[PDB]
From a paper:
In order to obtain a domain structure representative of group B and to expand the understanding of FnIII domain arraying in titin’s A-band, we sought to elucidate the crystal structures of the triple FnIII-tandems A80-A82 and A84-A86 (both tandems of type ABC) from the C4 super-repeat, which PaSiMap analysis reveals to be a prototypical representative of titin’s C-zone. At the domain level, individual FnIII components were structurally equivalent in both molecular copies. Regarding overall conformation, the crystal structure of A84-A86 reveals the poly-Fn tandem chain in an extended arrangement where sequential domains display alternating torsions along the chain path. Domain pairs A84-A85 and A85-A86 are joined by 3 residue long linkers that are largely hydrophobic in composition, having sequence NPF and DPI, respectively. Direct contacts between domains that could provide stability and rigidity to the tandem conformation are not observed, with steric hindrance between linker groups and neighbouring domains favouring extended arrangements. The copies differ primarily in the opening and rotation angle of the A85-A86 pair, which varies moderately between copies. An analysis of phi and psi dihedral torsion angles of linker residues showed that domain repositioning is singly caused by a small rotation around the psi main chain angle of the proline residue (DPI) in the linker sequence joining both domains. The [N/Y]PF sequence, with its bulky hydrophobic residue components, appears to allow only minor interdomain flexibility as revealed by a comparison of the two molecular copies of A84-A86 in this study.
Titin is an intrasarcomeric protein filament of vertebrate striated muscle that plays essential roles in sarcomere development, passive mechanics and homeostatic regulation. Despite its large size, titin has a simple modular structure, primarily consisting of small immunoglobulin (Ig) and fibronectin type III (FnIII) domains (ca. 100 residues in length) that account for over 90% of its mass. Tandems composed of FnIII and Ig domains are found in titin’s A-band that is an integral component of the thick filament. The C(central)-zone extends along the myosin filament up to the edge of the bare zone and is formed by 11 copies of a long 11-domain tandem unit consisting of [Ig-(FnIII)2-Ig-(FnIII)3-Ig-(FnIII)3].
Author numbering: 3 to 306
Amino acid sequence: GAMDRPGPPEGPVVISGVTAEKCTLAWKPPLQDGGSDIINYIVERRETSRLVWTVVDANVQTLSCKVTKLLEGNEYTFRIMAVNKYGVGEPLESEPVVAKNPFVVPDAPKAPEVTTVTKDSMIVVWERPASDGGSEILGYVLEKRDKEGIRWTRCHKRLIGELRLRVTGLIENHDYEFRVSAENAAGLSEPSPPSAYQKACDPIYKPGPPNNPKVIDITRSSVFLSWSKPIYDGGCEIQGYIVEKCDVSVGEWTMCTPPTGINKTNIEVEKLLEKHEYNFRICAINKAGVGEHADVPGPIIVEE
């Protein structure tokens, strides 16, 4: 048919790479070229307050254009026209875009730390950005890796909204290392360095004091003591008890057992000085160590 100028560029204008000084536009060719091929495109800009369109590039041989010399804080709208041998077609106008610098993802956090461990769980804790640089952190992603495993795995879906997570579902006696990432509106940070490997196992602690230490009977040179298992065994097996004596005139706590201890809740302390006055301490032994002493009630006079 008869020939004329091209149709408008097609499609939504797509704006990308927006900073405070530049941005990038892309469009698609017009559906109709008017009967002659499109020679070049014309890209124009107009700050929203202004009336005059200003030329960005009058000879764009591309479906994209890099706009520069933009000005921080100003809002712009952009225009694209197709040109052929018979003239300039109707424009394709973009949506308004403000020249802002983009938001940035947070910095990689510092390495997390494990605190409380069971055979199946670990509490992991980490720090906020030391200073509130405008990260605007929304939450965290905690990852774990088994020492006998290949890849890092998430300990949870979506985000952790605090500085801590009790990670469960851990395999007893496996060793795990942790790393944490921080996410803001811009996206996910690079991960932190890893924690040191920790083994999933129940901790053991020194035992508590022996229970109900008491005197049973007294002779001319001996004292009979008795007690019961400590209420708190330290998650560990009581393997023995240490008994100590003190002369109240002297004040030096001497031993009444080998350091190994005694495997009974009773003892007969013998060869004690007659009519002297004593105090007695009893201690429990774990694989972890010797726990707190329990003092026998009052001082005792060795008599009959």
